[PDB]
Amino acid sequence: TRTVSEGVAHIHASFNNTIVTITDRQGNALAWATSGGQGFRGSRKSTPFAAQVAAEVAGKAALDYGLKNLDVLVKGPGPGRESAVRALGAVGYKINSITDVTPIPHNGCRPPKKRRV
């Protein structure tokens, strides 16, 4: 429909669940997919096997716009952070850049206590 063809990627990676969203450079969302729609429904959502399928479903849903210009942003540690770009290359997207943009605070608020067990 739009076919500006410069949509960026936002691969949010967390220990519990991974989220990937496809939006343009300005930030207006285009299409997103998550492990929740996948159907593991539990701790298996964190597995890197679901992140790649979520990324590929997002890419197939986005190609209806005509996405081939990739700007990827990974935030937060945990498994499945690297599988998303792997699948997004497996489907065949051309790459503009890959870089790490996770925010680390400069002495932010007090963190929670340590879990003893």
Partner: peptide, 21 residues
């Protein structure tokens, strides 16, 4: 993210004592 208000001095002193040897 967690805090260790007492621990980092002990931790870094152990760090240096174990790195020197």
């Amino acid at each position: 993210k967690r805090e260790f208000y007492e621990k980092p001095t002990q931790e870094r002193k152990r760090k240096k004592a174990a790195a020197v040897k």
